[model samples]
Target: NRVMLPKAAGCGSMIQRTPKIQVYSRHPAENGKSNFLNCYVSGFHPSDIEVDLLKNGERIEKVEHSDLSFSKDWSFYLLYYTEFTPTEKDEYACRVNHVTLSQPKIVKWDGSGSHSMRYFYTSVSRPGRGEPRFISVGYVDDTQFVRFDSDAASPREEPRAPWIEQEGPEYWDRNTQICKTNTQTDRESLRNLRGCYNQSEAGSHTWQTMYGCDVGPDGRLLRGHNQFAYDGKDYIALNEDLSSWTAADTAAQITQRKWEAARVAEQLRTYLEGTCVEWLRRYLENGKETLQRADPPKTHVTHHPISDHEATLRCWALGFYPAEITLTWQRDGEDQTQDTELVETRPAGDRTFQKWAAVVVPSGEEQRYTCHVQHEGLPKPLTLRWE
Candidate 1:
């Protein structure tokens, strides 16, 4: 038989089996407020999840959370989170129940937990009054430096957008207050030290940073020259040699760096540049399997004559995604393996794959032979007989 062409993808309905539960906290150290504890239920399939927020064994009332957020890749799951204000003596917990688990999972919130005490208070500690320098709104470091502790408090407001703000290297004036420290206001060459403290995969915060060119002056607008710009790169090797920086930028070597910023191309490109473009191409186009289910297959039986007295029986299952399944031959109400020979399954140029199976049976006894097909896309196995 000839290869059957397949169609484009449709919506996907694959569901994963389990749900993951997490309890975490958000620090308002920047706005000078109490910490916020959050309960995160993540990587759960289907969207049928129930969660509870409890403070000191009592249910928290009127708690709200963001709408379900899917994984960036939409890889068959999603997540949700609710926030809470913490106190010294009270403990917090999150309870979750999903169909995949036999029992509900519970996660506790401890201010001293993994990402706790990320809050930092900076002051103008002039070392012998040398230029009266200032440290930026700092991040607490548990090692060499200790955080400032004081009763000094800031005006508290309801959980508003202005209250729960992220701590950045923003230029806080000399009037900027350091939480818990007497150092009020500062000046001169201050570098923001606020940074990520939670190393867990569940942490939702991220830092955006970038380097710049000498904005104050320009050397010479040569034909094409600028040290601060970079373009896309192309190299023969995957640069596996430097792949060890699997998490870092060791690939600086052996990598051919391109300066996309040098040409007009950089300004005209989409928000997501080179590699991000590649990622989208794979996910949005090729990765439609997660977004939509595929079209059904073309199933029909076609046969060829063997040696006059003998004959061949063939059943084809083509143009399908996720390789829907099991193929078998049966004779006289029993399974047959003796004369069966099935070729390897193959893929069509479109996006789906295919398969076919065949066997030889007695010419007249063919009345007792049947072809059985089973696939996830179908509710039940299909049986085809030679009329």
Candidate 2:
């Protein structure tokens, strides 16, 4: 049905209101995920208007527009939608062309906009001089919130994040003492381990422990892990059941039996599941803004001709935070994970990460392959082909 304005109303006063626009996805954005991108324009009058969903400043294809609707206050609203796979490399926007304005109103989808805690403790029996005996770093997600080092001249436990500053002197003092005590206990462990291996040389040996818990956005605990390493390798790890142990070697088996006899499993189980989660919740509450940030990655696909009849197709996902992403090469809608050469994700040196996946394919059939990217930052999963 056409929007008609009566002549009497047009003669009295034309009510013209500019549209307010919002760009978002129908589902929670997970880069490389399939979802509908919607442009909702409301509070506008005079239905003689246009709404365009755009990608990279060009109008996207196959967009559907909703029927004109009016609000209780007589203002008008409409929505434009299309299936999209969001990627940081592509800029998404909603352009509203209305007669009420001198220019089209363009609102860019800045992209889709998590809490956790971790404790990293390492004790090194360095036979060398001038190094801290034991160092421990605490992180609420990626931010190092607290640190402790056993350097006698400056033996202190310190807060590294702004929110950790809420800890008083007693907190620092208590943790400093605990670290000092752990340093002594770690030395004892090193001695026992040396005896277990019967090695004469003191040489640098390390014992490390990491235990943390992760909770979903709705406060449901997702996972918890606690493990110990000796000589930079996995010596022992606590099972999720909390009572069983995964001993890597005979040496670890001996320690595990002893620990089990002493009921160390129960002690650690309480800490890993209960105490750790409680602290994680408290820390998240204290540093919600920084600890729960997700930065999306920019993605692109490129082609390189290497051999006479073969070429390499590489998909790059870069400048993403949290270091979790998936990049795959799909041939005719099928995943080619076995043929893909994937690299470990590494830091981009500016608090972000970069990763790549490459696949070798016949040189002439480059168009048959597509690069699919998925990240937490994207409003939807992106699929790109080398053009």
Candidate 3:
């Protein structure tokens, strides 16, 4: 159910008081329950403050004229009750009233759930006077009696971060270029540069040579060195005359080398696109939902941008699966070359997770930034942005 109160005249004004009352369950034994309450007063000093606990409109206990403990920003009081047994189904309430004030603040809870309850205290003041009046609530829950685990439940590992895919065209193009360049370089160096020399009177001669006599069984030369003849087996090697061959000496040669270098770069780009990026994208898109087991269910993180600066960009991701996941920021399609800080994870209590990260983007290129998550088996990368 949703309820909205009439807007107070000083609704937008600052609140002068801190509604500081909190209630919690304390070491509840079988068939018995304990309760704890904390109260704080702020802004004004008051004499003779009273705290009371009521059960079904009947006053169960009260502490009067208590001096509060003071600190830098607050003055607080604590009250505790143990081994309190109720005759039947009953409602509990707490009230704090000032001796000089006409009306007191009341918080009530209709006993519900398994030893859990909540209530609030409200105030009434002038329409637009010093501060607007309000109501505050506190709650207590005894979780010991609740069953969070059950039998026949096979424990499973938590889901890990999902892998993200590299789907953008620019990412693919760069990867392809890197891969092709590397492949071409390897082929040229490994497959085409072997066995193109000649052994003649002139050692520098660039021609082919063939053995004329077979080796004897003893591995010695069978034919005498001078006695051996060409025997009508003169072989000519193509492009073997080095005397007339001049190495090219123009910028074109340099340009050609540069182009080859580019090819190798393209080869690297191709590998990144085909393997790394693809694997990341697939994992991000489907890994957690499909691969995680039942026990500690995996946490899936959703990414979002926080802030961007000349040399930094901040982002966040919320996940609950495999315990450890990292969020990263990239610039110009590459990981930022600056330091990053990861904030602590915020627990959502209901098997959910949330975390944030910040990356330093060197000045001038804030617009070209991306927030990404690194997890296992996700296919495409997941990203979020603010418009």
Give the winner by TM-score: 2
Off by over 4 Å in 3: 1-312, 360-364
User: What is candidate 1's lDDT per residue for 110-212, written digit by digit as tens?
Assistant: 4111110111222222334443221212111111111222222542111212212322333122113322122222121011111111132321211111111
lDDT values, one for every candidate: 0.38, 0.70, 0.32
**Per-residue lDDT value at 185 in model 2:** 71
Comparing 2 with 3 on lDDT, the higher-scoring candidate is 2
Query: Tens digit of lDDT per residue, candidate 3, span 206-257?
Result: 1111111112223232221000001111121111221111112232233234
| RMSD vs true structure, all candidates | 25.4, 25.0, 35.5
**Candidate 3, residue 13: lDDT:** 12
Give the C-alpha lDDT of model 1. 0.38
